[PDB]
Design a protein around this ligand. Structure first.
Ligand SMILES: [Cl-]
Ligand code: NA
Length: 129
């Protein structure tokens, strides 16, 4: 599914991401925009042979099992395919473990390069929440 901007903001707020570990809703919407273009079915292969999955491009090296990333961990205890669903629940629950691990949202390269230190409130402007 390809989410609209306000539609995704509303789904993320319902799932407890607004100000989760101090990150306002704008931060999560901006990250999803530059990571996946709001497409739950986005996949991208890394040079090390791991793969990034879903709306927040969660990496098979640490977070999910895809059966083809030898010697990787499965720290969210899910198949990577569960992260491609039109229901964002699994992506959201795994994202909360990632942002809690000590590096905050710096775990998402596109957040660090394209969202951090910008006016992120602009991403939720005009939405009914
Ligand atoms: Cl932080
Ligand atoms: Na893995």
């Amino acid at each position: 599914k390809v989410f609209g901007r306000c539609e995704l903001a509303a789904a993320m707020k319902r799932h407890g991401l607004d100000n989760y570990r101090g990150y306002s809703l704008g931060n999560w919407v901006c990250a999803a925009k530059f990571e996946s273009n709001f497409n739950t079915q986005a996949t991208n292969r890394n040079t090390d042979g791991s793969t990034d999955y879903g709306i927040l491009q969660i990496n098979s090296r640490w977070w999910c099992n895809d059966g083809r990333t030898p010697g990787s961990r499965n720290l969210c205890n899910i198949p990577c395919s569960a992260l491609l669903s039109s229901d964002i629940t699994a992506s959201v629950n795994c994202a909360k473990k990632i942002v809690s691990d000590g590096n905050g949202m710096n775990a998402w390269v596109a957040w660090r390069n394209r969202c951090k230190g910008t006016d992120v409130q602009a991403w939720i402007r005009g939405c009914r929440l």
